[model samples]
Target chain A: SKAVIVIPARYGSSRLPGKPLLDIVGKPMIQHVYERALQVAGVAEVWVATDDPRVEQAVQAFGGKAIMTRNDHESGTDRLVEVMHKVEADIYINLQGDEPMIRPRDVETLLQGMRDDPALPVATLCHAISAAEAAEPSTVKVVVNTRQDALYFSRSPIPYPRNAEKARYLKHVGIYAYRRDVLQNYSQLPESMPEQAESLEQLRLMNAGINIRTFEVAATGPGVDTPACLEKVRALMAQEL
Target chain B: SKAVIVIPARYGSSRLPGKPLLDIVGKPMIQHVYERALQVAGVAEVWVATDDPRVEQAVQAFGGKAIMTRNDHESGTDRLVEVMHKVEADIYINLQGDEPMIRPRDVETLLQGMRDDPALPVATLCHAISAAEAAEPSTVKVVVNTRQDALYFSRSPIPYPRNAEKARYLKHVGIYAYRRDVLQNYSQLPESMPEQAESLEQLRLMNAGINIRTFEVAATGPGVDTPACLEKVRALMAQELAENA
Candidate 1:
């Protein structure tokens, strides 16, 4: 099956403006993200889907392909829908621009999961949470049914640990892979109460009873979210250099 | 289909020991629950599934059927399963013995939901929680998917009601209706992490991918638990009599 990766990069940032074009070590952050996707196996092509011309220029400057999307789009998924229609691929990987340290193998694992079960419209990943990070609301928790399909995702810690302190929570990773039609019909799914309440977009699909088969993997490094985080990422990358 | 209601009563209680045998007005609390189930339209028979013989004797004295179950059972579901194998029925309603104030119409509504969807393995009731009752941890809350099936049941407030106050929480009524095979297969489902964490029997079914369709009803009065709640129920009973007097 033909697969392609699309990274939705918008220039607008509430904290650190021009985030994608921001220099991280020797390369722009979006370039680092694009290069990472290029390293993943089974990817026919990698395209940076951005609303900003500067980001497009930056991706082009780094010898990377870019797809221009409408600025009026609501979410990264909306930006991805525009790309899924434009790019011809059986499977589409919607990776975020912010995840500089995202693993290609993790991406491949999600894809392989879909490969094994073509019946699923979407696939995602989560890492096992085995500690008190359950108290942190930013660490979104997911509860899966027997089928390993997500029952719900919440900022509030679930499986609420009423009886056992040892209950494991699956911390959701935002990396998602959707087949063409699933990406096309995403916007048709109504925004549900849990979706808006937690501000988690995937809940909309879940509320509509769309299955998101999950694959588990070891926890990876954090993504660059703020200027300080970018500095830490730079330091980590420099150490590796 | 032949339908039977099984009220599971236990002799031990953390707050009020011998809770089911507590006198409401003229009869024990368990008898009131049994009589309530009897008033419902579609019930073929009502049986008190209890471990204690005194509880059984009380039921027999009151002309209500009683099924003796082993006290070694873990949950009311387990007790109901034991009773289910003994007394045959197509559908079984496991009504809690503490629910003296449970409406017959509400029970009928749940049974009707099963009647409408005969394929559903299990059925239960939840009432709309339009406002916040996050403070009431004793009240088990249910959040359903768009299909009107339970997403999760928690003592903690669901949807966490964050970012929006308009979110609805469906407070779970302990009453449940399970098909005979559903009850028989209940023990086969492994105890799940969510079920253990919440200490909710229903979560085990959910964790195993068993579909539990829920029916919505208006919020009813509380079930008797502690001595204080019993007093309130007695006062309500007298007030109810005074209203009709």
Candidate 2:
């Protein structure tokens, strides 16, 4: 299976405007994301899928590939579908632009999930969280069936841990991988009730009766969301380098 | 489809001794349960399965069916399985011996659930609960999947109804219908964690991944567990007779 990674970058961000163009050490944030994704072994190619012309020019300046998509796209996944038509791959990975520290191995793990189960249309990752973080409504939790297939994802901590066994509480990783056809269908599916109520986009596919295979990993790198988060990420990245 | 109702009447009760043979209005509690179960349209036969000979004699005295089961049985469902060997039926309804006021329509509803889903191995019932009852852990709750299949059952209020949609809370009813083989396997299966945690016998089947289709019923009569509950059932039965007259 051929796999392609598309990072959806936008020139405008509500928390931090021109987020993709923001400098991380010396490289633009989008460039850092693209370079990191390319490090993964199975990824056949990587492209920056952006809605703004400024982002497209910036990618060109850094000797990276970028696809201009419709500005009206509602989500990063929607922008991915448009750009995917221009490039071809059997599997598509929706690499979030805001996560500059996302590891190559994490992307590979998601890809392997689809490769392992042919019937699995979509795959994502989650990491074990402490009890306190798992209970936080802001930290969405995922419950799996006996087969390790995702039964439900909710803002409410699931399995209610009614009997505490110190079992791993999985915190969902935003990264997702879908078969080419699955991504297209997912893009067209209407928002479902649970999705609307929780404001969680992934629940739409779950409510539509689609099976989502979730892989558990050790830890997930932080993503840039707020100004303070960016400073923390920067300091973390500096320490790693 | 052939359906048989089995009332597991145990002589020993934690609260009331010889509970199944206790007087209810004019007849024993088990007699009332057996008669009502026989009223169901699709039921081919009703058998009162009990380990005690006295309970068997009481059933015979009333001209009701009775089957002697092994006293070593751990649960009521286990006793039903022991009786099943002597009588063969396509569908088995495990009617609680204490629920003398169990409606025939409720029995019919559980049977219909088995008929509706041939794939389902077992079926049960839940009733809409009042807002105040939702908070009481004693009132076991059931949360269903989109297909009305029970995802989980708990002594604690399920779905937590975090949004206060009090109407969403469903109190579980003990009546259950099982396919012949499913009931057999259920008795053979060892106890499970969720079953032990909640002290609910049905959770053993659920935790093992058996699909239990649940349907909503309008209301159910209070089950006779304590002395107070028995007195309440007596009053309710008298009120029912007065209304009929």
What DockQ do the predictions score, one after another? 0.67, 0.19
Give the runs in model 2 whose Cα sits over 4 Å from its true position: A8-23, A68-89, A165-168, A187-199, B10-24, B51-61, B68-86, B129-136, B139-146, B154-167, B184-209, B219-221, B224-234
Best by DockQ: 1
What stretches of model 1 exceed 4 Å from their correct place? B130-132
lDDT of each: 0.85, 0.80
| Winner by lDDT | 1
Q: What is the clash count of model 2?
A: 0
How high a TM-score does candidate 1 get?
Answer: 0.96
Predicted structure with the largest TM-score when compared to the true one:
1
Deviation from native of the Cα of residue B102 in model 2, angstroms: 3.2
Q: Each candidate: RMSD to true structure?
A: 1.6, 3.9
